[PDB]
Amino acid sequence: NSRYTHFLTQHYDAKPQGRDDRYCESIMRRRGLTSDRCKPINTFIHGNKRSIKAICENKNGNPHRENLRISKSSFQVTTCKLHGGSPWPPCQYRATAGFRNVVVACENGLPVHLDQSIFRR
Numbered sequence: 506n507s508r509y510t511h512f513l514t515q516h517y518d519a520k521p522q523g524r525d526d527r528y529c530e531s532i533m534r535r536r537g538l539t540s541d542r543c544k545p546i547n548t549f550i551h552g553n554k555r556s557i558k559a560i561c562e563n564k565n566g567n568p569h570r571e572n573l574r575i576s577k578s579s580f581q582v583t584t585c586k587l588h589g590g591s592p593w594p595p596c597q598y599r600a601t602a603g604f605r606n607v608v609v610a611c612e613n614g615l616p617v618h619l620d621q622s623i624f625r626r
Contacts, residue, residue: 508617512609516619517557518549521583529585529598543587543596548624550607551581561611569608573620576606584624 514536521528538544550557559565560576569575584601601624608620 506615508612509615512615512617512619513554516548516550517554518551518583519553521549521551521581524583524602525600526598528583529600530596533585533596533598539594539596543592543594545587545592546584546621546625548582548584548619548621550619551583556580557607557609558615560607560609561614561616566611573608573610575608579605580607582607582624 515538518532521532532549533539533544533547538547556565556578557580560574565577566574567577582603582605584603585598586601588597588599603624605623608623609616610618610620
């Protein structure tokens with residue numbers, strides 16, 4: 506799993522379209538990240554699931570800081586950052602497309618947490 510499915514829901518989008526402002530507003534809504542409070546910042550990873558869960562073994566990951574793992578390979582990512590004063594709907598978002606490695610925490614060989622610090626920014 507429920508953590509892993511929760512991670513995929515919040516942080517995985519396989520084959521994005523556009524990755525502009527409007528991609529962010531729409532995918533943030535669709536995935537339940539603005540229903541009560543506007544989530545301030547969120548990053549989506551793109552490409553295949555198998556490369557992401559492979560960060561959990563030595564194949565595509567290294568130990569990182571305290572209980573984290575860092576990918577050896579780079580991923581296409583989209584950071585959605587809240588723009589405006591209030592945390593309340595309606596939520597307006599700026600997209601930042603990038604290409605770099607990711608930091609995750611793994612549980613029982615699956616990714617369950619994305620470190621957002623590396624995307625703040």
